[PDB]
Design a protein around this ligand. Structure first.
Ligand SMILES: COc1cc2ncc3c(c2cc1-c1cn(C)nc1C)n(-c1c(F)cncc1OC)c(=O)n3C
Lengths: 148, 312, 142
């Protein structure tokens, strides 16, 4: 029961963080943002925009990291929400170069039982390559996961 | 002089149409929910004449006047408005967390005193209650209508309160249709619902009459979404309407792509009317709750322009 | 079988498919005297409501699927000619959006209940207006 409670608590936190991250990403890709940037493009205002953009990217990265961590924690505990591996792998693949989600996959992503990634085998094997390397390189971690 | 008044006139016409829609519905008609309106007669591109609302005073003049403002007669030991404005201007260039800390520090030492308006002007408890109820209802209907039309630049000097009736009148309607968010240091609130306006409502704040009037107005807005959509669609394609924000107005406010931006504004207004917010369909109560929390959030208020005077 | 065409790519084809699914007269006769008014409508509304409740999971699954490099869903003129004898990111975002309105229930900009959506789908499927326009190879009369 303590495990089941942890799984639900981790899943709820992951969903909230994912919602906030998706909101930030949608605002980034939204037409209002590009319209505001174009209006700026027409000297302190440029600096203010740069600070705002940097802080927004920082918030997006923070929310993404929290969501990934909580998804990893949720998948470890039990088996009712195995289907959230789809969201987890989508977040990982889209954010290949974060170097923090890759680190968390290298450390705690390996602890996940391997059978949970089975529905995503086609896409995972399609994405995997050899361009990136290193301990935290995306391709190296993906190759290790495929091998396991 | 040297100003364009056509935008104010057409905003007034849209307000009149919204008043008719509110009058048609029984639920709002019982509550006497109306939008205060005035006659604007533009005479040229840069000149015009318009009605003077007698018996009204700007809320900024009543609240934060330096010589006889409410925040000086009341709470004399608190920060003066000058110190608050100076601090908020100083923290402008700093990071967001510094902005939040400075804003909360100012708000802690600058407390609302707007509740005493009706208390001092109306000494009979029955009249005081009636005027306070009218004030709350006016705030609710004005906030909802402004959110629907995306009204912006709602600073202290752009709102008038009628001394006799204790009702709020909105002026200087140049910026609308969510164009304030395109500005530098963008506005992040649907409507002005700062601590003074909330305090003037009463001890209940937004929990009582204000929330319910907001849901009733929002429901009326929803039931007439198609007529409102047609009215706004006719309005925006006016060649002389000139609503799109341009850099000159952007610098002035703070010291064909037209088809695409117009259709974007139409879809945004349609989403507002049906209640689809951040991609999730919402009930009238849920949409009202979201709008209220976005309006009263100190996080959003801190990032605003000091000219907007969020602490006020 | 032969699941090559999906995600409304048949609507892009010449002589577009104008039906959500095959609900021709033979299929309806298969159910019996009640037709679509009986168990069919109830089962459709229940499965539609279930798919509505799990919209997030379906959206995530489809988002993972379409971003697969080798999935190759988009229609190209070669497949168009074979069937009836970067822009990729925009098309993917568009189909994800369309799936989103389908799951939420918004059809032609109007929010609909599960029953209303099911009724609209059935009436499109059995509509002779739509069935007449289809390709002869589709065999709508059959
Ligand atoms: C219909 O237009 C108005 C009616 C007013 N009626 C009373 C009143 C006003 C009014 C201002 C306007 C107005 C609209 N626009 C676009 N510009 C102005 C200016 N002002 C007022 C003010 F609030 C701010 N600035 C100046 C003001 O007076 C000169 C005030 O102190 N009182 C008592």
């Amino acid at each position: 029961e303590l495990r089941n409670g942890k799984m639900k608590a981790f899943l709820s936190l992951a969903r909230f963080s994912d919602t906030q991250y998706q909101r930030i990403e949608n605002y980034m890709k939204s037409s209002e943002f590009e319209n505001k940037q174009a209006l700026l493009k027409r000297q302190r205002e440029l600096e203010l925009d740069e600070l705002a953009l940097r802080a927004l990217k920082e918030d997006r990265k923070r929310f993404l990291c929290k969501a990934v961590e909580n998804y990893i924690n949720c998948l470890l505990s039990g088996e009712e929400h195995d289907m959230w591996v789809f969201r987890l792998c989508s977040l990982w693949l889209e954010n290949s170069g974060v170097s923090e989600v890759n680190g968390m996959m290298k450390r705690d992503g390996m602890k996940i039982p391997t059978y949970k990634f089975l529905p995503l085998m086609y896409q995972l094997a399609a994405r995997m390559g050899t361009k990136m390397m290193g301990g935290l390189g995306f391709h190296e971690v993906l190759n290790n996961l495929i091998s396991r | 002089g040297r100003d364009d008044l056509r935008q104010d006139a057409v905003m007034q016409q849209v307000f009149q149409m919204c008043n008719t829609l509110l009058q048609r519905n029984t639920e709002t008609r019982k509550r006497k929910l109306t939008i205060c309106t005035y006659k604007v007669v533009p005479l040229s591109q840069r000149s015009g004449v318009l009605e003077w609302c007698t018996g009204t005073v700007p809320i900024g003049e009543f609240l934060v006047n330096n010589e006889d403002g409410a925040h000086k007669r009341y709470r004399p030991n608190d920060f003066s408005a000058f110190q608050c404005q100076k601090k908020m201007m100083e923290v402008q260039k700093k990071s967001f967390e510094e902005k939040y800390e400075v804003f909360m520090d100012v708000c802690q030492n600058f407390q609302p005193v707007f509740r005493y308006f009706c208390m001092e002007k109306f000494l009979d408890p029955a009249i005081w209650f009636e005027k306070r109820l009218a004030y709350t209802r006016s705030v609710a209907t004005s906030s909802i209508v402004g959110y629907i039309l995306g009204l912006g630049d709602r600073h202290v000097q752009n709102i008038l309160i009628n001394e006799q009736s204790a009702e709020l009148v909105h002026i200087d309607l140049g910026v609308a249709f969510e164009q304030g968010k395109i500005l530098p240091t963008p506005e992040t609130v649907p409507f002005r619902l700062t601590r003074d306006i909330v305090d003037g409502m009463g001890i209940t704040g937004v929990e009582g009459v204000f929330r319910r009037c907001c849901e009733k107005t929002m429901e009326v807005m929803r039931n007439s979404q198609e007529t409102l959509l047609t009215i706004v669609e006719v309005l925006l394609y006016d060649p002389l309407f000139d609503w799109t924000m341009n850099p000159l107005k952007a610098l002035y406010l703070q010291q064909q792509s037209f088809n695409k931006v117009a259709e974007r504004v139409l879809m945004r207004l349609q989403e507002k009317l049906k209640g689809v917010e951040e991609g999730t369909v919402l009930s009238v109560g849920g949409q009202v709750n979201l709008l209220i929390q976005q309006a009263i959030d100190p996080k959003n208020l801190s990032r605003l322009f000091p000219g907007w005077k969020a602490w006020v």
